[PDB]
């Protein structure tokens, strides 16, 4: 209940003061981050679930935001859309519809739509898939319409940033170069590409033609420079370790491409990315499962 929440808030304030005393810091400037660090130090827990570790947050966060009963002592609900059972969702829809009406009166890249779980957390109300789809359609109709700054801010409450994903150094002799790293399977490589050179690659201190006898590995090495037409114009010193011949070739290729990105133009960097020369390959060996011959092959189902 509300009185319970008030008591929890008072207890949290007292506990915050006590924790500040315990860690020897100013209670007046003991932020939530300090509280979390102190709790993690005093009550260490290796449990992988972060929600299972000890927590002493504010009651506004520990307790669900569904709040106590939505009516006072008289029993009158606070919200006028309470009897809809989804007062948050329908209030939001009503506000969006009012915004659309006002837009009628007056007259993509780094963001995505929050998932249904995120919206449910926002409104602390359970919602159906079709309800979420209807709200998304309304929001997208709002966006497509000539939305103003206020509507853009309203949408940004639901926009979620998309997860889309170089230095130049000088040696002791003033040779401008770039250094980068790459991984492929188990092989790990570190490459150094100099700004000016005459196409000489030394792998582990050994020339590539003597270190990579297979023509395929040399072709993989040639791929980045040949893509940007810079064959024979750069000097590369790279060291690779682990894996086999092809894994090492791929790791060196990725490291060389990433390092060479420091010299080619931004459009050339984008072209290299679109060619796949910069994406770290996540294809790694899959573990063998018990009761099976291999990663995916089952044992021969016995003849019947």
């Amino acid at each position: 209940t509300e009185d319970f929440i008030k008591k929890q808030i008072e207890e949290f304030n007292i506990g915050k003061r006590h924790l500040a005393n315990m860690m020897g810091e100013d209670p007046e400037t003991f932020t939530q981050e300090d509280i979390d660090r102190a709790i993690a130090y005093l009550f260490p827990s290796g449990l992988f679930e972060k929600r299972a570790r000890p927590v002493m947050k504010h009651p506004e966060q520990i307790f669900p935001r569904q709040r106590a009963i939505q009516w006072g002592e008289d029993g009158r609900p606070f919200h006028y859309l309470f009897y809809t059972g989804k007062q948050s969702y329908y209030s939001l829809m009503h506000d969006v519809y009012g915004m659309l009406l006002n837009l009628e009166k007056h007259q993509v890249i780094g963001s995505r739509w929050l998932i249904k779980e995120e919206l449910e957390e926002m409104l602390v109300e359970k919602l159906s898939d079709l309800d979420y789809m209807q709200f998304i359609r309304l929001l997208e109709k709002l966006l497509t319409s000539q939305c103003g700054a206020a509507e853009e801010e309203f949408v940004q409450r639901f926009r979620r940033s998309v997860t889309l994903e170089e230095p130049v150094q000088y040696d002791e002799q003033g040779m401008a170069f770039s250094k980068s790293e790459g991984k492929r399977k188990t092989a790990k490589a570190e490459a150094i590409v100099y700004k000016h050179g005459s196409g000489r690659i030394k792998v582990n201190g050994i020339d590539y033609q003597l270190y990579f006898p297979i023509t395929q590995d040399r072709e993989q090495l040639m791929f980045p420079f040949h893509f940007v037409d810079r064959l024979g114009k750069h000097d590369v010193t790279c060291t690779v370790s682990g894996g086999g011949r092809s894994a090492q070739a791929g790791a060196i290729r990725l490291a060389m491409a990433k390092a060479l990105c420091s010299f080619v133009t931004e459009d050339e960097v984008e072209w290299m990315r679109q060619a796949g020369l910069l994406t770290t390959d996540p294809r790694v060996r899959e573990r063998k499962k018990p009761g099976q011959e291999g990663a995916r092959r089952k044992f021969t189902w016995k003849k019947r």
Binding site: P44, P290, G291, F299
Partner: protein
């Protein structure tokens, strides 16, 4: 305590093993368990025997349960008299 100290984390070791699931037959069904061993190496440099003993006692008496410790001590020594000059 005025002791130079450095910290690093050696790579963990995850020992895994497999057991038959059912008490009888059903060989194709197993349960796999593991025992993760996480490490932390503290290197303390250039401290005397008394300070080393005090610090080791302090950190060992407070060692949390479930955490083992392996302290390696590099004892500086002088050449014995027999080795400073040849007896021959």
């Amino acid at each position: 305590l005025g002791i130079s100290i450095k910290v690093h984390e050696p790579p963990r070791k995850i020992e895994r093993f497999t057991l038959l699931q059912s008490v009888h037959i059903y060989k194709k069904h197993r349960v796999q368990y593991e025992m993760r061993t996480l490490y932390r190496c503290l290197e303390l440099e250039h401290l005397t025997g008394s300070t080393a003993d005090v610090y080791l006692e302090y950190i060992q008496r407070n060692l949390p349960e479930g955490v083992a410790m392996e302290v390696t001590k590099t004892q500086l020594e002088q050449l014995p008299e027999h080795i400073k000059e040849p007896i021959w």
